[PDB]
Design a protein around this ligand. Sequence first.
Ligand SMILES: Nc1cccc(S(=O)(=O)NC(=O)c2sccc2SCc2ccc(Cl)c(Cl)c2)c1
Length: 285
Amino acid sequence: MEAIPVKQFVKHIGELYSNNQHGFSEDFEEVQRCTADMNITAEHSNHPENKHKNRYINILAYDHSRVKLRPLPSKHSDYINANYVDGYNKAKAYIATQGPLKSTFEDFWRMIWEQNTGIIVMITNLVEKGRRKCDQYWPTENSEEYGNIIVTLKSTKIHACYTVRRFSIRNTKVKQNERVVIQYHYTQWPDMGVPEYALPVLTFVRRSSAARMPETGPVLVHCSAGVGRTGTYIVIDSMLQQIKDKSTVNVLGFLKHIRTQRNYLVQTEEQYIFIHDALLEAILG
Ligand SMILES: Nc1cccc(S(=O)(=O)NC(=O)c2sccc2SCc2ccc(Cl)c(Cl)c2)c1
């Protein structure tokens, strides 16, 4: 189970799809079992003092890979539900994290400053099908203050399927010192069912990924829980890098791997199939 030449990957997709996606089903179940003989601790996520900091009681941040906040003059001011995740070759190329709650906007922006993140990839809407997915952690307009980071919205471009917001943030307890942070926000979400046509996404991935500057902190990627759509993004992004580099693909292997770094990355078979549709589009296009 290693890399597949890009020229036979497309053929492979045919096989995975046939007989009602039986092959896709076997792959993803392998992925879900891939953790089986594996205990990964998330004690910090389960600590009573950190509970109100998790959006979902079941969606945790593995200890070994968790992003640590600089502790504050309490014992658990270091905790945020987030994990470093690997990209193509490069270790810790992403921070995959949940959609921020009101009570964690400070942690969220502190992490971004502390990690020197320059790009945010947002893969949810605040509200979807009437349900709360994510609290708005940025200024509707002008500036807003979170802890010692105050964020200023500088410009916005709204496309068919996503929006790009350029922020300038300054730390007040520095010097102040300022950074640009660019948010890529995918906004095109189904009233009924789930996303299906992968081409607009491929474009989103291509443009947000190309926005990464040398040599900066990891790209922050979040949806709501920070595992499903977030994992889909990371795999599509990484595999496109691999294709450019070596003209080979390894979805099943890379995914089993990043699954050790954050629980449930790529959460459903449908998302798993979607990754393949995205990459098929890139290859044929
Ligand atoms: N159970 C469950 C958990 C989380 C999400 C869902 S869900 O909404 O029903 N299901 C989904 O979100 C699905 S299912 C197939 C594709 C997608 S998302 C495709 C997509 C869109 C924009 C970007 Cl930028 C990327 Cl990289 C990928 C279901």
